[PDB]
């Protein structure tokens, strides 16, 4: 969960490398995707698509077993400036596609840098932020120019806890070395089932291994099998992903000046060659 | 760090390029000499 | 990201030809 | 797309006829 | 049926003449690269600094540093500007013959620029050397923490008429 | 006033030089694809101009070169124009050649008379790719110091020297201010006098055999 | 947000304006 | 008409040119103010003008400070050198590496010293050139999009 | 009466000979001049440092810098390396593929070098990616204040023979 | 081995430049001081080596420079002759030019066919000072640092644009960083081309008249 | 013997030059080997020599690192700026200053046109320019020691 | 006294300007030298010259008003590593030559810095220093080079105590402007003459000058002299003057190379000659 | 800050320069011509 | 103490027989 | 620390002399 | 300088020596 981040990594949800924190428990990897204009004019609406796509008629295991399907979420970083539009400056048209999003910064300040969800994955497969970009008219300390934007998404019930203990949305090794006995499924009146394991054999030994409800099973009964072995199965189908972009806060003084440029240019070129043509025509008389 | 148009216009270039290259080594493979070569 | 790419990449190389006819263009019309 | 590629037509068109209004302007009197 | 040297000398002007502009066009933002970014763009007189250009703290410099308080700060322009409760003034310490920085002399109340023997007031104004004209002056004022340097409009108060400087 | 002309001529000839150049002649086989030279030439002059231009700002150390880029893009007064035009000129500097060598190859004009002038742009075009490769490093970005902290070790394998020669670009064991340093004065100072001795060459040369023959 | 269009629009203009006019100037290919 | 002076072929010192390789500058247009004064301005300007737009439409970033401890991921050199990163990251055996590498210029100073064979310069009249160079150039963008895909997609390309 | 081709190459053999010593001569300081001065011309194994390259206090560290002790310090030659009561040797950072610092996986207990996906394990030693050789060593004791590292010499405690970095 | 010579003089006519040189003779009013022109440039060739040297280790930045000296002084090896060098043939180039200018002089050798020679000559001397100007602050101790601080005001005396190129030469209002960059630029990028483009010029005249004639 | 090649007063070529003032390298000893191969390398390693010992004997220095708030005393520019600092500090007129500043080189570009009057190269042969010249050289020296002097006795030079 | 440098100025006795402390009190200023040999071997001993001269048969105001000479001193700094040699290590010949001279230090710590007196100017008008140079083979961190020595040299009574308050080697100007009306000269049975002046007239006034007895009397009677006026005349005969210069502390390797360097290029020059010889003869064959 | 060693190398060759100029301006102002001027 | 005046010498003489070299070779002056 | 000056100026006048004469003595001793 | 003068005479003369003494060596061989 977005706010997990937030309690986990309170300074940044960026590490040095780049990395973003959810990789931390959220240990699939799907693809993830980032959509802005190429440039926009100071003090400007525009739209940030953030892409988040899964097979939709598709389910994964909840956490006490069932099989629900699974919400999104993205942490999406705007560059220094940028924040979320007022409600009141978003048009209707783009207010319709944005739907109920609760855009929740980072950390107080930091309000370029956006959290959000959970949400449910059948209608949020592309999240849509109105966005506001920035002013260096009136703010002197941001500068026209190309900025970075970085965006991480997920989908699907992630791997670790805070606590810091393991979920059931993953696999479960084997805990020592040796031979597999029985297989027994308790069913706590509260805590769902639970097949327990046992191993045994050579050097001594009686560990057991307690096993979530919800991964399958693609184990037998009396083989042998080493400490820290696939025993479980991959229950996961979600996954967190990452996409870049660039986007240019761009000033129209600088585009109509280098349009002028060009204008000058152009016309300056036709001048030449004209002037070409009359040589041409004057070094015709020099033939005969 | 990648880059998108820049990638781009090598390929447009180098294509458009390998391309009239071609074309003008074979305009000539046909009509050539003149002049006295 | 990459729709930038082929964007740059098939313009690059039409607007050659367009570049190109062009100049033809105003070969004929000026009589070459 | 299809707004730049008016602007892009009109702009060129735009040129081009100045090369060739210059032209014989230019030609049509006696300067070519 | 030739165009004669009238008109042959018409069309260079149109080309080279647009050729020009378009050069001309780009040397324009080339040449104002070059010309430094300006100092306060905003007012005319920023803080003051020390040694490392920092920020003079103002019980720092009133608890210790020096007694008859006459020290070396990094005023307006970066110009080392002597400070002299504090005094309204600063007295810019460049002297106005070459640009060596002045001591000054507690024992003899004048300055010396020992470049070429040229001496100041406690004022800023000269009574000899080969400096043909006053050291600058400034206002020192309080903003909260530090100092803050004007630039000094009014007349000379030490001179008589407009000041060399403005 | 008193024709300039004849005071220059009377001392150098200036008219042996004026005849030199208004006698070479362009041959029909000379196509738009002759132009990717002097194109090349032209993003080498806009490299130099703009290039030239930010050494009065840029400061080519670990503490200060980032910042110094920063300025030169938010403060510098179209800085942020000069800064461009020089990462975009050494983008086309670079494509533009390997054009030309298409057109080169694709008209055998490195043939018999000329197989100097080729050995010579292949020298170039090394040359070249050094500027790319040392310029990137500059603004000690964290694209730029990685990069350098890659290429830097490829030299070690080579057996008996390559170490040394790692040793040598890098100013040490490891990337750091030496390293900067050393491309500093690799872009800033070696690489233009190399590039331009060997452009030197080049074009002597093409001076001296006029332009290869019709294909 | 649409000058940005002409913008963009420039730069093909100038590429292919600057062919249109060499191919001219030279009768060229 | 354009402007045309043929090839004086009854100038012995033309001739002893042409054949050697190289008398071509003497006949054609005349490359003074028909070519140098006016064509080159154009170029040049164009050259200039499409660099400015690019500059100003698609202005230069400022990346993140260098950190010694933090590897990027997204770490790839200029385009240019995609090939020879490739090549560099895709060979198990480091000198391999380099030699293969070393190979790319030194390679093409051979090319002149090979293909000397004969005397052909259109490309047709050379069909076994005119394909080594074609396989090449496919080969190079071929490993420069590899660089762009994770190491074990590289070659395949994803696709076999 | 004129001496002979002979001859003549032996003035030059003498003259153009002592030349080029006198030019080796000249050359060779300016060789060395390139070749940057030696890390510790004294020992093999220096102090350690942090961020700053400054050096890197023992109680500071062991007291707060993250928990099951695997941080990285500016080790032998500059290379990042991880240090994990401490313990007795270093892990070089640096993959063995091209050189990238691997991250801890405290979740797997593997190194994972992400340029190209190989890994290796607690000790250094390599269980997949493209890097063909484990992480370097190096030993890890304390004198007075911080952290002193020396290289590795004896045989890889993890390998079975000679180290491929003695 | 398959003679070098022919391959050479097949395409470039190697031969023609032997012979350009085999042709030239020196004059008997030709004497000892008919060196000091070479005597000059050789000064400068050592400059250019050792400056390019110093390039691998000087960092242009206020808080580095004097330590970068330092560095090169005691830790680089033959760092302290490099420098030494560097210094002397600073002085001794200054000096043979001034000896050099009163050859040509006392000889005449500046008249109608060779003004230019000449004039090319003094921008050479004020290009020549520039070097030794601007380098002479890059250690920015104290010497250096207050000779900066002094000569950047002169400037300001010129009545439209005096202070207009004070500060393009100070990179400001005063001396500071922004003033040793563009110091640094000046003395290791423009004077170097400066130099290098009025040299070729001094010396093609001077090809190209010979010397001058004897008195 | 020597080794001489009289001019060739026979060819017109020479001759025209002669008369620009101008083929004084035609005629002389050979300027290939017995120079260019054989003294100019004496005269070169000679020149690097004296700079090499001067080096080693007299090392440059490390002065002290500079202080914005402390002027030295003993602040003087390199010996060939004497003449122009000496100028510049004891003129009370700035602008004065720079002009005869500026008027050094200024001067000295004229001078070939100055001097042009006559055709004269020996400087006996011209005893007004020898003289100028002579004075000039003189007043150089006196106002570059007056440089190390103190500023009042200076011109005097401590004598009158 | 050098030693009241020290404790005015404890750090150091020269200041970021080079000016060295002594000329705050010592006010005249008289010329001082030092002599060095251009070049020192490491660890060698070798003889540093500080000269201070003045006219032996002149006399200076002692601080009752006697007439007796005046005492010279030196404060000496040489380049890091420097020191004053070992009395062992000293030749007799020297050793006679340096006299009973308290080489003292500017601080513990500081042994190339050394302060030098009250010596008895009729004899010391040379001080010689008896200084061994260091070793940059046992001692990694002096450098051999070329290295800056400092000298400030004094002869005669300064002008101010560091307690701060005039003394009697100077001048007394005038305490406020108005005229003179007595001068009486006082004779405390202890603090000697100290000839008083008055003045007055016009605004008021009646302060009084109180001068010690030493100095001059140029000043009459009935007189209206303004305030700060040359009324004493100037009795000091002394001053204080600062000479600087370097030393090379040279290592012999260095010049052993540059020796053999030196014959090589020469023998090489030899070499060309001979040749170009051998070239004039062959050539010769060829003229006929 | 000033340079003994060297402030005397430049008046020595200075004066012993401008001298030997003079002495061969003089050695030709009076045995000159020959070869034909 | 004097392989220090060895070296100032090397000066003087490398000056001086360069002198010396050049004039001989030149036959000259 | 001036007797340096004086010291080099006098020689590095002098054996100018020194040299040339020391060439002239070569050549006749060679027989120019 | 006595001693400067002494080592001074005796190099330079060692080094005048090996000249003469090589010229004729080497003439009185038929090398020159
Ligand atoms: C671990 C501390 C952790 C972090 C930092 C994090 C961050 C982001 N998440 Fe998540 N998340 C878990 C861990 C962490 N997440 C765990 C464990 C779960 C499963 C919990 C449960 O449902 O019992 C989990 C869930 C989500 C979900 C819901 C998925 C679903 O459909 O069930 C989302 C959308 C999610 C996203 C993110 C994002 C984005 C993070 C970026 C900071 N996590
Ligand atoms: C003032 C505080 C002061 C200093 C810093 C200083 C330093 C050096 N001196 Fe001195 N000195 C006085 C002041 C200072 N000196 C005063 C006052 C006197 C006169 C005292 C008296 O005799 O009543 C004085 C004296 C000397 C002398 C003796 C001169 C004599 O012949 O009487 C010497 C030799 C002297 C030298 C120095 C040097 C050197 C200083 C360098 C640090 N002072
Ligand atoms: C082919 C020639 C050149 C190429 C290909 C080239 C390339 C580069 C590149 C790619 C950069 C990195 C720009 C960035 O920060 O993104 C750069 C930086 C820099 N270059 Fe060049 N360059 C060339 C010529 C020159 C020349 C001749 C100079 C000096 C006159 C120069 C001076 C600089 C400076 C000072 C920087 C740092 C500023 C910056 O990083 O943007 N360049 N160069």
Redesign the interface.
């Known amino acids: 969960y977005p706010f997990w981040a937030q309690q986990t990594y309170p300074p940044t949800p960026r590490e040095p490398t780049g990395r973003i924190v959810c990789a931390n428990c959220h240990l699939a990897a799907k693809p993830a995707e980032v959509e802005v204009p190429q440039s926009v004019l100071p003090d400007t609406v525009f739209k940030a698509v953030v892409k988040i796509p899964y097979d939709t008629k598709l389910q994964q295991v909840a956490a006490d077993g069932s099989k629900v399907g699974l919400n999104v979420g993205a942490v999406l970083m705007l560059p220094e400036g940028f924040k979320i539009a007022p409600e009141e400056r978003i048009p209707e048209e783009l207010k319709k596609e944005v739907g109920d999003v609760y855009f929740q910064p980072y950390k107080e300040g930091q309000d370029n840098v956006l959290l959000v969800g959970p949400l449910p994955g059948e209608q949020y497969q592309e999240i849509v932020f109105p966005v506001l970009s920035p002013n260096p008219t009136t703010d002197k300390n941001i500068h026209f120019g190309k900025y970075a934007i970085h965006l991480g998404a997920n989908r699907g019930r992630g791997q670790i806890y805070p606590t810091g203990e393991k979920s059931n949305n993953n696999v479960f090794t084997a805990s020592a070395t040796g031979t597999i006995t029985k297989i027994a499924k308790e069913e706590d009146e509260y805590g769902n089932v639970k097949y327990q394991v046992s191993i045994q054999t050579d050097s001594g030994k009686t560990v057991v291994d307690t096993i979530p409800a919800g991964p399958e099973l693609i184990v037998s009964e009396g083989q042998a099998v080493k400490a820290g072995e696939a025993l479980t199965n991959n229950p996961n189908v979600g996954g967190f992903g990452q996409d870049d972009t660039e986007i240019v806060l761009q000033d129209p003084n600088r585009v109509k000046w280098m349009i002028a440029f060009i204008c000058l240019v152009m016309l300056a070129q036709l001048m030449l060659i004209l002037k070409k043509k009359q040589v041409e025509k004057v070094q015709a008389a020099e033939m005969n | 760090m990648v880059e998108p148009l820049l990638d781009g216009l090598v390929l447009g270039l180098v294509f458009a390029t390998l391309g009239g290259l071609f074309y003008a080594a074979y305009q000539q493979y046909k009509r050539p000499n003149e002049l006295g070569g | 990201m990459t729709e930038e790419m082929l964007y740059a990449a098939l313009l690059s190389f039409g607007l050659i030809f367009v570049g190109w006819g062009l100049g033809v263009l105003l070969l004929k019309i000026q009589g070459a | 797309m299809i707004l730049g590629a008016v602007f892009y037509i009109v702009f060129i068109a735009l040129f081009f006829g100045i090369a060739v209004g210059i032209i014989f302007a230019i030609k049509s009197i006696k300067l070519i | 049926?030739?165009?004669d040297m009238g008109?042959?000398q018409?069309?260079?002007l149109?080309?080279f003449?647009?050729?020009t502009?378009?050069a001309l066009?780009?040397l324009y933002?080339?040449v104002?690269?070059?010309?430094?970014?300006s100092?306060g763009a905003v007012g005319g007189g920023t803080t003051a600094k020390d040694?490392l250009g920092n920020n003079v703290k103002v019980s720092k410099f009133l608890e210790s540093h020096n007694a008859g308080d006459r020290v070396?700060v990094?005023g307006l322009?970066?110009?080392?500007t002597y400070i002299v409760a504090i005094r309204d003034y600063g007295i810019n310490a460049v002297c106005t013959?070459?640009?060596?920085?002045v001591?000054w002399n507690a024992?003899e109340n004048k300055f010396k620029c020992?470049?070429?023997?040229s001496q100041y007031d406690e004022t800023g104004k000269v009574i000899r050397g080969?400096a043909?004209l006053s050291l600058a002056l400034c206002h020192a004022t309080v903003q909260d923490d530090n100092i803050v340097l004007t630039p000094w409009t009014e007349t000379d108060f030490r001179t008589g008429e407009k000041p060399w400087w403005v | 006033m008193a024709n300039v002309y004849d005071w220059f001529q009377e001392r150098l000839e200036i008219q042996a030089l004026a005849d030199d150049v208004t006698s070479k002649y362009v041959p029909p086989h000379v196509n738009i694809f002759y132009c990717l030279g002097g194109i090349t030439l032209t993003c080498f002059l806009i490299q130099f101009a703009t290039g030239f231009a930010m050494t009065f700002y840029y400061k080519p150390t670990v503490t200060e070169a980032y910042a110094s880029v920063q300025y030169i893009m938010n403060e510098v007064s179209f800085g942020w124009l000069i800064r461009s035009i020089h990462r975009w000129s050494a983008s086309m500097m670079v494509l533009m050649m390997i054009l030309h060598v298409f057109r080169v190859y694709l008209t055998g004009g490195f043939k018999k008379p000329r197989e100097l002038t080729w050995i010579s742009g292949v020298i170039l075009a090394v040359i070249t790719v050094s500027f790319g490769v040392t310029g990137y490093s500059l603004p000690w970005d964290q694209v730029g110091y990685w990069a350098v902290k890659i290429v830097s070790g490829v030299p070690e394998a080579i057996p008996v020297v390559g170490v040394l020669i790692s040793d040598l670009l890098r100013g040490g064991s490891s990337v750091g201010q030496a390293t900067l340093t050393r491309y500093y004065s690799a872009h800033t100072f070696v690489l233009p006098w190399l590039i331009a001795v060997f452009m030197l060459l080049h074009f002597l040369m093409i001076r001296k055999q006029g332009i290869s023959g019709p294909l | 947000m649409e000058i940005d269009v002409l913008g963009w629009v420039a730069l093909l203009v100038v590429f292919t304006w600057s062919i249109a006019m060499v191919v001219w100037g030279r009768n060229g290919l | 008409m354009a402007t045309l002076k043929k090839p004086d072929l009854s100038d012995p010192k033309l001739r002893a040119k042409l054949a050697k390789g190289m008398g071509h500058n003497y006949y054609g247009e005349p490359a003074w103010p028909n070519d140098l004064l006016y064509v080159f301005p154009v170029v040049i300007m164009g050259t200039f003008a499409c660099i400015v737009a690019l500059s100003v439409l698609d202005p230069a970033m400022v990346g993140e400070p260098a950190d010694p401890f933090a590897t990027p991921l997204e770490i790839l050199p200029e385009w240019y050198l995609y090939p020879v990163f490739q090549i560099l990251r895709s060979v198990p055996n480091k000198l391999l590496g380099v030699l293969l590498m070393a190979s790319v210029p030194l390679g093409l100073i051979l090319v002149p010293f090979i293909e000397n064979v004969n005397k052909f310069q259109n490309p047709f009249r050379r069909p076994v050139a005119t394909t080594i160079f074609l396989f090449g150039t496919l080969v190079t963008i071929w490993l420069g999009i590899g660089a762009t895909f994770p190491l074990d997609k590289t070659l395949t390309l994803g696709l076999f």
Chains 1, 12 share one sequence.
């Open positions: 049926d030739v165009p008109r042959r018409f069309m260079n149109l080309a003449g647009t050729v502009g378009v066009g780009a933002p080339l104002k690269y070059f010309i430094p970014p100092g040694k070396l990094q322009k970066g110009d080392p013959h070459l640009g060596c920085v001591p024992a020992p470049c070429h023997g080969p043909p």
